[PDB]
Amino acid sequence: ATRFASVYAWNRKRISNCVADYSVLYNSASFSTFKCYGVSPTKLNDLCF
């Protein structure tokens, strides 16, 4: 984003009716911290939400 909301009013965006690609993110090095607690981060391409 240009700007993000504060924690007291944390922003929430709905994602539906679209084709994702978590491999594009997972290959990026800009992610200092990336941790998935209910699914393997690599397996996201083969799982449908």
């Binding site: 290959n27 090095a29 981060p41 690599t42």
Partner: protein, 49 residues
């Protein structure tokens, strides 16, 4: 019975990638440890060398 010393150099953020069973670009496309890997991992800064 023997000891294999695997010596190489990386950037500081990829040292978490070198644990056994880990995944990531280094761990996927140039150097992958076995899942049942036994041994030791050593990493030290060399910005002065």
């Amino acid at each position: 019975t023997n000891v294999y010393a695997d010596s190489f150099v990386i950037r500081g953020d990829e040292v978490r990638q070198i644990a056994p069973g880990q995944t990531g670009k280094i761990a996927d496309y140039n150097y992958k440890l076995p899942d049942d890997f036994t041994g030791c991992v050593i990493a030290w800064n060399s910005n002065n060398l």
